[PDB]
């Protein structure tokens, strides 16, 4: 029952999703950061072919 891993970075200059813009924020916090979820759906896209 092995798992999968993914290389998650933390950014600081992002393109806002509310508008057409760009934002900055402070560097990350000092300490341990955890986060638990469970994907329940997703978004795909076809590919024009024959």
């Amino acid at each position: 029952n092995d798992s999968i891993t993914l290389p998650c970075r933390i950014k600081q200059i992002i393109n806002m999703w509310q508008r057409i813009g760009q934002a900055m924020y402070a560097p990350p916090i000092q300490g341990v950061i955890r986060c638990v979820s469970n994907i329940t759906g997703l978004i795909l896209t076809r590919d024009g072919g024959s």
Epitope: R9, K11, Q12, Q22, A26, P27
Partner: antibody, heavy 128, light 110 residues
């Protein structure tokens, strides 16, 4: 690292406006911040203000605010300072400084404040 | 207005000996301070950043520490080319309003 060459020293008549340059060379240009600091002969250091390239935004000093203007240009890899209403009380030596920041182009950035590399320091004589 | 002051107004000490300097703040500046030495007429040099660590490519005989409003730098054993004026500088506040210290003159105790 990078190297910061400057322009040639200058003399300006009072009540004028001065422009001064500083060129950097040695590494990818955006990934470094920049700052301008000056010193009168044998005195402390006068923090003038700084600029962030990747966003191209500059911050200025409170009691200097109004007659200052920093600017940059990613094409030619240079930095310009301009100062307005020249007054003889500002003859001094000037320095352009920088510091690495991180993978800006990929959205990483840490906004350091201190000053790693240094230029020589041009001289400006405002006087009669 | 946040203001720092160097101390003493002048330190003097002979070779083989240690120098001690203390920078003074007006509020709590958590870990934002830096130390540069300037030989007269020369481009200054970065010694201590983060107020707790040493630069790269620099002799290990320097070290500082401190917090709150009191900071310090000490060098245990002077050498022949440590004769320069020394400045402390903070970069804490945002929006950025940075400021520089006075600078203290250091010549041999002789």
């Amino acid at each position: 690292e990078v190297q910061l060459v400057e322009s040639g020293a200058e003399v300006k008549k009072p009540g004028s406006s001065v422009k001064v340059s500083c060129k950097a060379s040695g590494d990818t240009f955006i990934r470094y911040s920049f700052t301008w600091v000056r010193q009168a002969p044998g005195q402390g250091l006068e923090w003038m203000g700084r600029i962030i390239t990747i966003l191209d935004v500059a911050h200025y000093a409170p009691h200097l605010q109004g007659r200052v203007t920093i600017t940059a240009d990613k094409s030619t890899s240079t930095v310009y300072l301009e100062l307005r209403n020249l007054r003889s009380d500002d003859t001094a030596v000037y320095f352009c400084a920088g510091v690495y920041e991180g993978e800006a182009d990929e959205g990483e950035y840490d906004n350091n404040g201190f000053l790693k590399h240094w230029g020589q320091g041009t001289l400006v004589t405002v006087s009669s | 207005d946040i203001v720092m002051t160097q101390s003493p107004a002048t330190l003097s000490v002979s070779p083989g000996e240690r120098a001690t300097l203390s920078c003074r703040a007006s509020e709590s500046v958590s870990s934002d301070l830096a130390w540069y030495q300037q030989k007269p007429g020369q481009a200054p040099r970065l010694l201590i950043y983060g107020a707790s660590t040493r630069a790269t490519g620099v002799p290990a005989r320097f070290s500082g520490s401190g917090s709150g409003a009191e900071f310090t730098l000490t060098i245990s054993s002077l050498q022949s080319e440590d004769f320069a004026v020394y400045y402390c500088q903070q970069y804490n506040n945002w929006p950025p309003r940075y400021t520089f210290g006075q600078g203290t003159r250091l010549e041999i105790k002789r």
